[PDB]
Amino acid sequence: SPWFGMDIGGTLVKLSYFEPIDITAEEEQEEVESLKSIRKYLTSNVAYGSTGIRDVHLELKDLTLFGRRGNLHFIRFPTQDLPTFIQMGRDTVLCATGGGAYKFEKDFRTIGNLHLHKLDELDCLVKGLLYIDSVSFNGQAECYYFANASEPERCQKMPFNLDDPYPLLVVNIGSGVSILAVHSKDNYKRVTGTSLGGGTFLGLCSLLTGCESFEEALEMASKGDSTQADKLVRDIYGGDYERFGLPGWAVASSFGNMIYKEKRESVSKEDLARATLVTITNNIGSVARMCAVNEKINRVVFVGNFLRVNTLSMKLLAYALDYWSKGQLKALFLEHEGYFGAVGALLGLPNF
Amino acid sequence: SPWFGMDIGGTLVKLSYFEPIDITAEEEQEEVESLKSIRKYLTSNVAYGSTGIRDVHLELKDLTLFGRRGNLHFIRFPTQDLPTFIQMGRDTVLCATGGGAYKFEKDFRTIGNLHLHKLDELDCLVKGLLYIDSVSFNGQAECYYFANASEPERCQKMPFNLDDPYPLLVVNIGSGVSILAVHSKDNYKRVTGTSLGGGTFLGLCSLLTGCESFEEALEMASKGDSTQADKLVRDIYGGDYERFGLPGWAVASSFGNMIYKEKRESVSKEDLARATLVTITNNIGSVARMCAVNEKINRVVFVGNFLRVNTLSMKLLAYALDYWSKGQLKALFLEHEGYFGAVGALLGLPNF
């Protein structure tokens, strides 16, 4: 049976697949054509159907897992298309996490004899994050930050060492946001969450701009000026609010200039996309900072797929966390940010 | 000169006016017709021009202030119409607070010989809040809460004693949100703020629904179902997420169902208004709870005009704070919630 780990989220299904590369002569004979067809289908295609994608650049090559050498592959598709995935599977032991492991349990069991083992979505996140950091990204650091995040002429991605990862605040930005405090490999808590997450960005963007993909929303936002929609401190005070250290450029009221009809009539879709992105990202950063101060943790790592191909939000988080914390907190990022739950699920396989 | 206190905010101007009622025979003679015209204009009208309103029900009658007996009146109009107010004034010492005291300083000085004294917006809030609570609301409590906020057959407004008000977390929901920790009458700090405030509600509502007043946005929201727009925990898990105590009804992703085109096509304007209100209010409640836990304060009072005639948001705050804190925090409300800055400014008059 193939070794798969699956994280079925509110928006995306993430799949980690271990392809063995040490297949001996006898093992290849004693393999059923169905298994060979699966392996060849997955390794010879980068798109699967109309909505599945293999993230080839994330592949971990020549990993030793469960005593075998192989390549770890990372695959995603929308949860909306899980019926297609299951139907293909109908025409093995599955470690699955995320809410969909529960919601679609009965659907997975329409696959004859399949054994479904549900694992907790935050247990899997912590286990997968710690594992990937431990084995490295093909010899490169899994974890990085933006050095000198306050000056754009200097700001650059740089590696960060997590050899002693504890304590750690993990901010998981998916459909919503979950915030975890990790104190040891077996001691962690869900501190809180917020419902202003990636699904809010995409949902509001679609309502406001008519965009029909995450990537299109980001492209619009890169062209926009959020200050056309937001009311800034300087719009209220005429400058800084000096007494409490609020600079004139800080947002006082997100979308607050949209209470004026003439401003609603002149704002562009790109401006509204950028204001949505800035609003969601700043709120996540601020909640992360408050949790970090309360948990007495100074390293904050952001994961989840809201940040995939989203350098705007990563740089905003890096700058905002550093600026508003007076340098006490650092925003950390991970190359495999969307996939840790799926890896953690795969790692649960020996228990079954 | 008339005794006025003014708070010029990003959205509304709030004015407190002390009308003396112990005017002797000689004082009435030695009063200039301009002053008499002002007093009669203010006390004989409840609407001023097209956008000014006197909140008659908030009037404090027979208050002793600066050694005189009088009535304290509460008046509001949009900051957008401040040019009209100043032009009327051109055709006295003014204690003014809010950002507009700085932004419009030069405009106020077009009134000949007028002495403008700028006072800090959060100093004035604390002073005015403590003062009004101290003198009472015409013998009734200024402060109230919703008793048994978890059961609607029981939930009812009840008075709350703030005789020993410290410590206190003050959540000021205006255009944006400011959060204050008040430890004594002269010891308080701005803990943080969020830009997801009343201006976000009104701005997003106008973009999404075409409403053109705060009151119309609230009326739409009262008719809506926010779960048509929001993705809930049960939409992701099929039920509760038991492991971390998340009930199926909790919002996992605000507007998160709007990533689906078919759902964007069936949602009503009333549903979007309600989802906007719920999103903003829950985020404010959650930020308040985190600040309360970090400041080690268990009494949280909400002020500002986002909550005027807004019982939906007050009940949501009351319920959410009690539910998510496991009963450790209580949401408190104040009858004069929008006007404390203007009163605090008026109270600064003896210093000039």
Ligand SMILES: Nc1ncnc2c1ncn2[C@@H]1O[C@H](COP(=O)(O)OP(=O)(O)NP(=O)(O)O)[C@@H](O)[C@H]1O
């Ligand atoms: N191709 C995409 N399609 C949809 N959303 C995308 C895509 N790429 C990036 N995103 C963003 O990724 C977010 C979902 O991130 P993800 O970490 O996969 O969440 P999830 O696990 O499916 N949700 P959750 O149940 O809350 O844990 C979406 O809300 C988008 O903001």
Ligand SMILES: Nc1ncnc2c1ncn2[C@@H]1O[C@H](COP(=O)(O)OP(=O)(O)NP(=O)(O)O)[C@@H](O)[C@H]1O
């Ligand atoms: N008649 C109204 N017109 C406009 N907004 C109203 C009205 N009534 C209630 N509101 C709400 O009141 C909020 C403004 O509250 P308010 O406490 O007066 O803020 P402000 O002081 O003007 N802003 P700030 O500069 O941030 O302190 C608006 O964002 C609305 O959500």
Ligand SMILES: CS(=O)(=O)Nc1ccc(CC(=O)N2CCN(c3ccc(Cl)nn3)CC2)cc1
């Ligand atoms: C695991 S998931 O897949 O279902 N995703 C997921 C599920 C839920 C959430 C939101 C969350 O965690 N909430 C809700 C908000 N909340 C409040 C609200 C008002 C107050 Cl006063 N206090 N707290 C705290 C708890 C985020 C993401």
Ligand SMILES: CS(=O)(=O)Nc1ccc(CC(=O)N2CCN(c3ccc(Cl)nn3)CC2)cc1
């Ligand atoms: C006094 S006013 O009239 O001008 N109104 C007013 C002014 C400003 C604000 C927002 C605020 O206080 N902010 C900004 C957000 N912020 C962040 C952001 C990212 C991170 Cl990582 N951390 N913190 C904290 C500080 C609210 C209301």
Ligand SMILES: [Mg+2]
């Ligand atoms: Mg997830």
Ligand SMILES: [Mg+2]
């Ligand atoms: Mg104000």
